[PDB]
Design a protein around this ligand. Structure first.
Ligand SMILES: NC(=O)c1ccc[n+]([C@@H]2O[C@H](COP(=O)([O-])OP(=O)(O)OC[C@H]3O[C@@H](n4cnc5c(N)ncnc54)[C@H](OP(=O)(O)O)[C@@H]3O)[C@@H](O)[C@H]2O)c1
Ligand SMILES: NC(=O)c1ccc[n+]([C@@H]2O[C@H](COP(=O)([O-])OP(=O)(O)OC[C@H]3O[C@@H](n4cnc5c(N)ncnc54)[C@H](OP(=O)(O)O)[C@@H]3O)[C@@H](O)[C@H]2O)c1
Lengths: 287, 293
């Protein structure tokens, strides 16, 4: 089986290693071609140009910095007739739309998008899940090949859905990390032990697994009443900022304060955090 | 309360949590004296055997043990203003506030001659108060904690975290930081999903695993922070680009964007040459500088 990979960054090299381990004949291209150095002894062929790399195989795996770079790399690649593109470059839903439209206008058989939900060092383990979006029949053709990078989950036939879902999941993760950095800064500056604190904290974050579905149900049915009030949540954030200032510690969660303050001004002070969702869906604003 | 001879307890504050505390103390058999600015919120406790005191001073005179649960530590100070004498009184403050607000209140009651001050951080909502699964952190003199343990079992399970009165507030604010970030992320995720036409409940099924995962990831990061091991983990540069992807996903959908303070501190990290470090490397950027991000 002939497979081409475009991009040999930390994730690209991890993908290259997984595909070699799968037993495929691998053709690779990278802007910095010397990053293929470790793949040549495994039997990988180095293509001079994107165009050449694409010519070598009917299945093209892409893992570059961003979808802007993907479009620039595909720029001169004019002939994709017969080619299946597997794009594992993270980006936005509409970025995936523009790339899928570009390759399909140039002949591509299909486009499927993958969001890898792990780091390079765990790629290829069954516990490592990649969300896949695009035509079912294209997923089914590529499922065996894709197993080389871990567990695939077909989320939708719409190519833009892996990026939509992965961006949603990264919001949650980003939120968790913002609160956690703030917590550890406070605990550290107070002379407390970060590991002991995690022993106390990590359990209560476990708990959220239970509460996040409840909040999600309330949001769908637009039931914004029921649960700790937004006024209470905003006071909490004011105690966090001042607990921090007392210790000379800086504070995150500014956007959360700003949106909750405006909610109170709009008279939603007595609603639960479910009532913050329409604050976002209704207005294009960076809080 | 195990004795047929029911002890006298005073309660200052009858908001949602104060009224939950009242019902816990009445249900445990206490002889309860209450005060509230809005006196009529006591009305539901009177047919249960609660006495309503005219003033905070009268309330404090009625019991050797005073439980306080008010809006904030400033209202606590305002309410103790005309209380002259706390001789032989134990003060149990369940009002949320900062570490130094607890210090400032602990000096108000000490100056009045209070026997002791302990602080409690209730880690649940009023409806779950009194279930043994409901945990309150207590900080203050371990001997005062020990004496008040049976009385405190009325509101559920207590955990003595420290002899320092400021610690319950320190730890609770640190815990509320984590929860605030979780909720900020969740509201952003739900807004993107909703605006795209996807099913919030279906998404919760997909995403509830990831938050459970953080049972493991968080103690890993804590360890890294304590050893100042900032290298190892997905780098801040990749974190920052995921935030730019999130901002632009939201913009495509006409949806607003939270996580600004995170975007700002991670950008500065990059400028300062810490782009290759994990999230652990952001902790020293907070501890080094009194700034709002
Ligand atoms: N933990 C992770 O790393 C992780 C996890 C999940 C998904 N991903 C995603 O996987 C993708 C790649 O990640 P990575 O960690 O491999 O990033 P990386 O190590 O920075 O690699 C960047 C890749 O993009 C190429 N590149 C950058 N600018 C270019 C340009 N102007 N023209 C041509 N090529 C260019 C690089 O080529 P050079 O080698 O010549 O610089 C390299 O192949 C990203 O979308 C990322 O979001 C990463
Ligand atoms: N989920 C929760 O509700 C929860 C969970 C854990 C901890 N807590 C903590 O418990 C405390 C009270 O919360 P809550 O839910 O009871 O709030 P609440 O329902 O708003 O109760 C506020 C209380 O403070 C009193 N108050 C406000 N301003 C005052 C003033 N200027 N002078 C005198 N009294 C004043 C109110 O008097 P009136 O009745 O006359 O208005 C009422 O007794 C807070 O520190 C909170 O963080 C709450």
């Amino acid at each position: 089986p002939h497979v081409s990979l475009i991009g040999l960054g930390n994730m690209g090299l991890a993908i290259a290693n997984c595909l070699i381990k799968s037993g495929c004949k691998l053709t690779v291209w990278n802007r910095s071609a010397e990053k293929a150095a470790s793949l040549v002894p495994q039997g990988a062929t180095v293509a001079a140009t994107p165009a050449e790399c694409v010519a070598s195989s009917p299945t093209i795996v892409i893992c570059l910095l961003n979808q802007d770079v993907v479009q620039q790399t595909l720029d001169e690649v004019i002939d994709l007739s017969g080619k299946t593109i597997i794009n594992l470059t993270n980006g936005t839903p509409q970025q995936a739309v523009k790339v899928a439209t570009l390759v399909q206008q140039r002949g591509a058989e299909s486009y499927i998008h993958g969001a890898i939900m792990t780091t390079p060092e765990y790629l290829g383990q069954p516990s490592s899940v990649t969300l896949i979006s695009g035509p079912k029949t294209a997923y089914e053709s590529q499922k065996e090949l894709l197993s080389s990078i871990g567990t695939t989950r077909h989320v939708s036939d719409d190519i833009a859905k892996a990026s939509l879902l992965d961006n949603a999941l990264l919001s949650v993760m980003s939120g968790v990390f913002e609160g956690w950095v703030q917590a550890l800064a406070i605990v550290g500056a107070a002379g407390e032990d970060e590991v002991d604190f995690a022993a106390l904290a990590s359990p209560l974050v476990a708990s959220m697994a239970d509460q996040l579905p409840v909040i999600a149900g309330r949001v769908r049915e637009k039931q914004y009443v029921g649960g700790s009030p937004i006024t209470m949540g905003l006071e909490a954030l004011e105690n966090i900022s001042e607990t921090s200032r007392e210790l000379g510690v800086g504070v995150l969660l500014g956007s959360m304060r700003e949106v909750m303050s405006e909610a109170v001004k709009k008279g939603k002070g007595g609603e639960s955090i479910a009532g913050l969702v329409p604050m976002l869906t209704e207005l294009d604003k960076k809080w």
